[PDB]
Write a protein that binds this ligand. Structure first.
Ligand code: HEM
Ligand SMILES: O=C(O)Cc1ccccc1Nc1c(Cl)cccc1Cl
Ligand SMILES: O=C(O)Cc1ccccc1Nc1c(Cl)cccc1Cl
Length: 393
């Protein structure tokens, strides 16, 4: 019986034990999705990297044979997602409009603001006193506030858009997903319309001006790009901050090193990215045959990338299952690779460094406020992260 994919984690920062056979099937195995369909899983580092660079894999989920890992997804997959869900040459043209807003230089220039936002968040936690619920108090507002400012979406609407984002990603039913998407779409169409008559500051305003008013894009494409950036902007980073904190608290000795040597923080973020691999199960379909690792992925077969197992490939990383700040994590695929490699990674690094580093610098007593194995975390059919994170100090 193939391993069923995906499955819930049991320890939120490790691959599930049910993936043990995938660890031994490297670089490539087969797996069963929810409707019984059989597809390729990619489990080796070298093969992941080859394949994520191969224009013979498609990310367009509207293709007839594109794999669906949930019923919910199967239902919405008749609609394209801008950028992430588009192939070259169109992917390329979209990316180019966005890239200037997401440079390393832009990220470095935002750091003072990131630092101030984090300081204000930890200040409020400290004013209210422990315990705190770290996801809602910190891990979520930092990146939500930041992407709102960067995009020109008002953080004042965060309760609405965060709520709809959750329903959108998680459902659980088709109806929840369609309702969330409609509410978000209508919110974003109104926003864009408002911005057309009275421009603000923000990437969305730049896209309207420098793109739409050239005829280079339309409004639906903007809504799609805006949804993708708003959601990836806040969800991925919040999950990295919350799961990162949880992981660090459960590895006292690695945490103590970062405490002594804060200069390690960039390397720790990169290692936390590899070790946690929250964006697990990336989806493609072959549109032509691809020979790889001595077999052939054939046209129309589903291909799923088991990011977590890949980033624990010993060929990729010595002692891959150790959390370590000194063995390079460079070349991990937690931000993907090739064509769709994370647009927001420069920003995401600055956020995680500043947030995690300041958190532990400022609340040196920090610790879990409930038993570890009672703290809820997200299921395996979505991007991994804590749902809550009770802490004290
Ligand atoms: C820890 C934080 C993050 C992680 C782990 C993460 C992970 C990923 C991964 C794995 C991909 C590739 C998806 C695939 O190939 O199917 C991706 C793409 C993307 N990320 Fe992130 N990301 C993070 C933060 C962010 C942030 C802050 C943004 C901000 C807007 C963002 C925007 C995107 C976009 C737009 C893409 C699509 C790129 C393309 O299609 O060309 N990400 N990211
Ligand atoms: O999947 C959907 O229908 C919702 C949607 C709408 C617009 C843009 C992106 C997305 N979903 C979505 C997002 Cl929000 C982030 C990463 C990957 C995907 Cl498929
Ligand atoms: O990029 C894909 O193939 C879709 C996919 C599958 C599993 C896990 C994560 C992602 N994408 C995705 C990203 Cl890249 C950022 C935020 C939220 C989501 Cl759902």
């Amino acid at each position: 019986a193939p391993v069923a994919f995906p499955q819930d984690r049991t320890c939120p920062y490790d691959p599930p034990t049910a993936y043990d056979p995938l660890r031994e099937g490297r670089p490539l195995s087969r797996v069963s999705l929810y409707d019984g369909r059989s597809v390729w899983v990619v489990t080796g580092h070298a093969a992941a990297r080859a394949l994520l660079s191969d224009q013979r894999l498609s990310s367009d989920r509207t293709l007839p044979r594109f794999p669906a890992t949930t019923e919910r997804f199967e239902a919405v997959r008749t609609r394209r997602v801008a950028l992430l869900g588009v192939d070259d040459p169109e992917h390329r043209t979209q990316r180019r409009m966005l890239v200037p807003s997401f440079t390393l230089k832009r990220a470095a220039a935002l750091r003072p603001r990131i630092q101030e936002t984090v300081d204000g968040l930890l200040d409020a936690m400290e004013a209210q006193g422990p315990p705190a619920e770290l996801v809602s108090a910190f891990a979520l507002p930092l990146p939500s506030m930041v992407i709102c400012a960067l995009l020109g979406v008002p953080y004042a609407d965060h309760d609405f858009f965060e709520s709809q984002s959750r329903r959108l990603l998680r459902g659980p039913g088709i109806a929840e997903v369609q309702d969330a998407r409609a509410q978000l779409d209508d919110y974003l169409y109104a926003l864009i319309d408002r911005k057309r008559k009275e421009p603000g500051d923000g990437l969305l305003d730049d896209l309207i001006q420098e793109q739409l008013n050239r005829g280079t894009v339309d409004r639906a494409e903007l809504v799609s790009l805006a949804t993708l950036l708003l959601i990836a902007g806040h969800e991925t980073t919040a999950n990295m901050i919350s799961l990162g904190t949880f992981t660090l608290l459960r590895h006292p000795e690695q945490l103590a090193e970062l405490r002594a040597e804060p200069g390690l923080m960039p390397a720790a973020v990169e290692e936390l990215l590899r070790f946690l691999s929250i964006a697990d199960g990336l989806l493609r379909v072959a549109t032509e045959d691809i020979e790889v690792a001595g077999t052939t992925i054939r046209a129309d077969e589903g291909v799923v990338f088991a990011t977590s197992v890949i980033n624990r490939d010993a060929a990729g990383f010595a002692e891959p299952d150790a959390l370590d700040w000194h063995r390079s994590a460079r070349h991990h695929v937690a931000f993907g690779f090739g064509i769709h490699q994370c647009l927001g990674q420069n920003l995401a690094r600055a956020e995680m460094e500043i947030a995690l580093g300041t958190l532990f610098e400022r609340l040196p007593g920090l610790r879990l406020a409930a038993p570890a194995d009672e703290i809820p975390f997200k299921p395996g059919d979505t991007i991994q992260g804590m749902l809550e994170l009770p802490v004290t100090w």
